[model samples]
Structure formats: structure tokens, C-alpha cells
Target: EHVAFGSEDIENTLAKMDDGQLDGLAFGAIQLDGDGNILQYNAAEGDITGRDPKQVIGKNFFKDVAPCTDSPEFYGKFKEGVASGNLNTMFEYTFDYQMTPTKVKVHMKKALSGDSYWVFVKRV
Candidate 1:
């Protein structure tokens, strides 16, 4: 069985998945550290964002990977969650810089097992 996108308890499910498993998911899954560094950029995410995971790891998601997210509405909210240690925000966003404009559903949540964050995405 696989965890579905938009599932209520996806954070927990994702925590247990390996990189290979994460890549197999239908939706995009990008894991990041508190500093916004990319930990794991799954295959689906690469496909959706037109980026390669090999070149993305260790880069800052808000800065290097996707600068379009550096604004208040996205990065600001993530910083707020890091400060509060409770990041469970969901919103719809459009990716319009450096790639084809793609509308997507985003779910940002704190990882249950580590000091990391998860950015789950599904094409809208």
C-alpha cells in the first residue's frame, strides 16, 4: 500500500519511506532542513519542477533550488514554523520562474522523526 497525496497523516508515512520509496510516489516530495537545505528531492518533484535531484541535494530550497519561494508567503511562513516548531501549512501555489508555470498544491509540515521539514506537492 502507498500513501496517497493529501492524506491527513502523510508526514508520518513519509518519515518511514526511503529515498527510493519517496521517488516512487505519484506526487512530489521534497525534504528540507530547518535552514531550507534540500535533503531529498524525489523523482516526482524533479519531474514537476524540471530539476534534477542529484544537483539539488545540499542546496537551499528557498534560495538555490527554487528562488520563487523566497518570498513572505512561502519562505516566511516556513521560517515562522521553524521558530514555533510546528509547521503544518497547506496552500496552493504557482511555479513561474525559470520553468513552465505549473500550479500545484503544497503541504509543508515538520518531520516527526527529525529536525527536518517536508514539502509535498501535487499538480493542480
Candidate 2:
């Protein structure tokens, strides 16, 4: 239970959390494919991004859902990590959407089970 998103065991720790646990976290948990498609969206992500999981689950996160992330700062690193096979990175930025400019910490980690990445965020 002492798992932190930037920990060395971050991927395994998140992998252990079931759907319900993911949904109940106090921060955002978004599972994404190699191309940034939203494969899993948790309740906290909905609260942070102002998006229903239903609206995001099948969408491209960096491009469609939050185009601000499509910039080189966020998405560029993500794509580089996806190609390099290492995504244990963390950074902070504002989530500018719908006029709600919320500051957040974005944690990108490789999935323990698949060729996917988990983009976890927390309000800052």
C-alpha cells in the first residue's frame, strides 16, 4: 500500500491493483496503448480531466482528449519512451481544458503485462 507512482516498482504496484482499486484511488490512473489510446480510465481521471471514462476509453489521450499533452513536452517524451521501451518518467504541467487550468503531475510507466503505458496523474 506504500506504492508511489515514481517508485522503481511502480509498474508492478499498479498492476496489482484491480479495477475497483484503480477506480477508488485519490488520483488519476489512465492505461494507454503504445499510441496513447485510452485503454483504461479511472474515476479520479474523470474528476481531473472532466471526462467520463466512457468518453475516453477508446480515444487517443494525448491528441483527442487532451491536446495540450500533444505538445512535445508531454507527448514527445511519451512517444520516445514508447519507442525506447522505457517510460519511467515524471513531470508536472497544467491541464488546460475547458478553461480549467489545473496543475498536475504526470507519471508515465510501462505496463508490467503488456506493450502499454500507464499515465498516472495527481493534482498539484
Best by lDDT: 1
lDDT of 1 by residue, 1-124 (tens): 3778878888878886778889878889988889999888899999898998789999988877788999998999999998999998999999988998999999999988677999999999
Whole-model Cα lDDT per candidate?
0.88, 0.84
TM, every model: 0.94, 0.90
Task: Give me the candidate number with maximum TM-score.
Answer: 1
Per-candidate alpha-carbon RMSD to the true structure: 1.1, 1.7
Clashes of each: 0, 0
lDDT of 2 by residue, 1-124 (tens): 4456567777877785776778866678998899899888888888887898767788988778898888889999999989999888889999886758999999988898677898989988
Point out where model 2 deviates above 4 Å: none
Clashing pairs in 1: none
